Design a protein around this ligand. Structure first.
Ligand code: NA
Ligand code: NA
Ligand SMILES: [Zn+2]
Length: 866
């Protein structure tokens, strides 16, 4: 297929202002009637080009006159000789049961539901499928009453009828103009959890949460989380819901996580259903994060939408930012920041070095569903967070207000948003805008000098962005670079220049610059890039002692964690080198002492201690190398864990027992203690083998909740403990009837350190709880194997690569979106050694030759092979 370019955006030749949809629903054959009110803005000789994919066109009318001046082309219906204003009427057929891709109107179990973002509405009827076309929708739905007792669409339900032959109908009307991507429709049978929420200004909102029959007992957390989201948006952003009714439907077959369709969010049931015996703390916090995210989209995405898809980050970065602020307000800000920074450096940096690298605002897109990315979302959010960092909360809030005042009811661009922040705040963001147009990870180098004569500290900070596959020309960014200076007793030294205060966020705007601070009364240990103030790799020659100093004294929790990460990074590299030469782990005692100090600091938040005692993941430490040796990294993570487990066995078991809790609560203090406790258990599982088998076996049989059961089952697999197969068998036997719970188990299989893991994963393709048609099962088994087991995926014999090729050969035909998610590990080939490159390259070449190669794979495969 063929690329679209951001610089080619033009306002459309036509607008639609109102559309009236009728659906005569049936899974085999749905008939859609679509009456649209349209207007020509372009030249009269310019036809109306309607997108449509896999539609059967039954008829076309223009002001009620059967139209003869039209034709069908590659994925469009083109209509000529139109007046300036007219009513378009289209009747077409689609087939939901055939729709395995889950784009458009498909079937999720017995239910019918939709997914329209980015360009799925065109799989439902011929339309102007692009988000700068906003219209008022009215949606009539007709269906078999026994099979589809609930019939849902956006807005308010405004009519209702029965018919002969056991069929009934409902009609919905949504007063707010929207682009078609936000359209949704659900038909099916559900248990419904109903509650209400009263807004800050008194508006009462009905809340309805639709789940499969039987699951009303895993719903209340999601409902609570929705309410918390609604309250928080009021408190922090001053934003209230704008309709009478908030529906959420939880379906099992879903490609995204969840989707912000106006007043009728549709969710992967993974990000709704929770019970203490089925869901972990991390699940609960995820459901919270995702429910909030779709809710915050009501303003940042719906009330103001995107002019074109290249502007995706206008809504995703800002809505991710909003979900992060919500989680951090209600829980631990530091733990939140830490985890978000682990994601940026672990996963996102890799993408920004890959064939798939793009700016948060892409300039070129072949298939748009390939741009729902770590970059657009997470880096997007970091870019928003830099704006916040430059402006401060009061000014950032004024920008939000101006953004809405200007663009409420319309579609906007990244630049529009950046301008609202500029105009409202008076901070100049012209240079800052470069963050939107430039790909890749900047590298910020820092050199320092202390001068005891003058009591001056000098930072020489310089920056470069290396070239990326997608751009050859790079330039300096506007980098907000936050610092704190610590004196010898751990107290902050004030930042001054010429005896006037100086702001602790430094504007690093040039390729190289020098900052000088006065009255530095003692040689400082610096905290640099404080709270990851910009998404950059930092290069500074730390001594280990500076790093341990920060772990004990730094005032910002995040810096303590981050210093520990920098400390470990040196020894991860050292030990990967040692591994390559057949040597055992080397690890100085002072390093171990530093981590002992954290464990027995009784004034440190247990959640912080827990993150500090969580080792970088294999992906996070792969970022430290040019060539990745994934076997070495895995083997090194294992060894480093054993070593600490031996070195700190007594403290670890003490803290493990100290944070035992008889009550289970989903409350931030309790989650912290359970997180620390289970981090301690993870180490002990890599220690004395009998004690391990006992603790891990006992915890598994004696929880209480899924957080503690999985933490133990998971150590049993990681450390290959004697009790493992039995625990894995209990779990299967209990939980097999339940996919969302089985997903955890598949992930564990797929990420097993054991020897024949691939052979196992293959066989699990036949497991009772696995199915190739459910994106969740695919992501847990196959996706976890390829993405999170790089020691087995990258076996020297190329067997992991061919396994993926098999799976992709299937999924390219079945579900291109899921397939594109799965291919990502294979297009990282240039970070591996030559032998691995050749084989990976070979596998991409095999997939490049598939009949009916999907656009989604195509785009990634050609970039990887270029
Ligand atoms: Na319009
Ligand atoms: Na907080
Ligand atoms: Zn979003």
């Amino acid at each position: 297929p063929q690329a679209k370019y951001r610089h080619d955006y033009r306002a459309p030749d036509y607008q639609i202002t109102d559309i009236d949809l009728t659906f005569d629903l049936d899974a085999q054959k749905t008939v859609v009637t679509a009456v649209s009110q349209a207007v020509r803005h372009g030249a009269s000789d310019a036809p109306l080009r309607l997108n449509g994919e896999d539609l059967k066109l039954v008829s076309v009318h223009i002001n009620d006159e059967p139209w003869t001046a039209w034709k069908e082309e590659e994925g469009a219906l083109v209509i000529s000789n139109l007046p300036e204003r007219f009513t378009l009427k289209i009747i077409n057929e689609i087939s939901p049961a055939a729709n395995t891709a889950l784009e458009g109107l498909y079937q999720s179990g017995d239910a019918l539901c939709t997914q329209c973002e980015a360009e799925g509405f065109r799989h439902i009827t011929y339309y102007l499928d692009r988000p700068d076309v906003l219209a008022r929708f009215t949606t009539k739905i007709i269906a078999d009453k026994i099979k589809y007792p609930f019939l849902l669409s956006n807005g308010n339900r405004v009519a209702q009828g029965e018919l002969e032959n056991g069929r009934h109908w409902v009609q919905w009307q949504d007063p707010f103009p929207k682009p078609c991507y936000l359209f949704a429709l659900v038909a099916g049978d559900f248990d419904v959890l109903r509650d209400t929420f009263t807004t800050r200004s008194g508006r009462e909102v009905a809340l309805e949460l639709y789940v499969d029959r039987g699951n009303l007992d895993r719903a209340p957390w999601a409902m609570t989380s929705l309410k918390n989201s609604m309250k928080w948006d009021e408190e922090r952003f001053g934003l209230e819901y704008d309709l009478d009714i908030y529906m959420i439907v939880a379906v099992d077959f879903f490609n995204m996580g969840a989707m912000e369709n106006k007043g009728l969010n549709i969710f992967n049931s993974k990000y709704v259903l929770a019970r203490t015996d089925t869901a972990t703390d991390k699940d609960y916090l995820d459901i919270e994060r995702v429910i909030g995210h779709e809710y915050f989209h009501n303003w940042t995405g719906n009330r103001v939408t995107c002019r074109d898809w290249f502007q995706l980050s206008l809504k995703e970065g800002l809505t991710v930012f909003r979900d992060q602020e919500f989680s951090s307000d209600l829980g631990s800000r530091a733990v939140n920041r830490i985890n978000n920074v682990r994601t940026m450096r672990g996963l996102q940096f890799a993408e920004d070095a890959s064939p798939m690298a793009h700016p948060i605002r892409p300039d070129m897109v072949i298939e748009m569903n390939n741009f729902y990315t770590l970059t657009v979302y997470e880096k997007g959010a970091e870019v928003i967070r830099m704006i916040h960092t430059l402006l401060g909360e009061e000014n950032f809030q004024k920008g939000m207000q101006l953004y809405f005042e200007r663009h409420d009811g319309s579609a906007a661009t990244c630049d529009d948003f950046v301008q609202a922040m500029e105009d409202a705040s008076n901070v100049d963001l012209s240079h800052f805008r470069r963050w939107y147009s430039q790909s890749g990870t900047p590298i910020v180098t820092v050199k320092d000098d202390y001068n005891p004569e003058t009591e001056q500290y000098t930072l020489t900070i310089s920056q470069r962005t290396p070239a990326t596959p997608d751009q050859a020309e790079k330039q300096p960014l506007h980098i907000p670079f936050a610092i704190e200076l610590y004196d010898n007793e751990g107290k902050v030294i004030p930042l001054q220049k010429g005896g006037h205060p100086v702001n602790s966020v430094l504007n690093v705007t040039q390729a190289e610059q020098t900052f000088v601070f006065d009255n530095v009364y003692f040689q400082p240990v610096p905290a640099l890039l404080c709270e990851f103030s910009a998404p950059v790799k930092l290069e500074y020659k730390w001594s280990d002692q500076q790093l341990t100093f920060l772990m004990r004294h730094a005032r910002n929790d995040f810096s303590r964690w981050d210093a520990a990460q920098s400390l470990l990074a040196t020894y991860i590299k050292l030990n990967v080198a040692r591994h390559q030469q057949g040597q055992p782990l080397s690890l100085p005692v002072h390093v171990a002492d530093a981590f002992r100090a954290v464990l027995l600091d009784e004034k440190i938040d247990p959640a912080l201690a827990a993150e500090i005692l969580t080792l970088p993941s294999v992906n996070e430490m792969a970022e430290l190398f040019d060539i990745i040796d994934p076997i070495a990294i895995a083997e090194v993570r294992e060894a480093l864990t054993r070593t600490l487990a031996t070195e700190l066995a007594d403290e670890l078991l003490a803290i493990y027992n100290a944070n035992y809790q008889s009550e289970y609560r989903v409350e931030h203090e309790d989650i912290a203690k359970r997180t620390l406790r289970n981090a301690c258990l993870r180490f002990l599982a890599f220690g004395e083998t009998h004690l391990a088998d006992v603790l891990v076996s006992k915890q598994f049989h004696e929880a209480n909740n899924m957080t503690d059961a999985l933490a133990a089952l998971s150590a049993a697999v990681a450390a290959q403990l004697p009790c493992r197969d039995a625990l894995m068998q209990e779990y299967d036997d209990k939980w097999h009837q339940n996919g969302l719970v089985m997903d955890k188990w598949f992930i564990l299989q797929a990420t097993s350190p054991a020897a024949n893991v691939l052979e196992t994963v293959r066989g699990l393709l036949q497991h009772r709880s696995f199915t190739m048609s459910n994106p969740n099962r695919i992501r847990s088994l196959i996706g976890a194997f390829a993405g999170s087991n790089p020691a087995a995926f990258h076996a020297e014999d190329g067997s992991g690569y061919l396994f993926l090729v098999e799976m992709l050969t299937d999924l390219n035909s079945r579900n291109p979106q899921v397939a594109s998610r799965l291919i990502e590990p294979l297009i990282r080939l240039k970070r591996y050694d030559a032998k691995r490159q050749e084989k990976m390259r070979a596998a991409l070449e095999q997939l490049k030759g598939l009949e009916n190669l999907s656009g989604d794979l195509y785009e990634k495969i050609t970039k990887a092979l270029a």
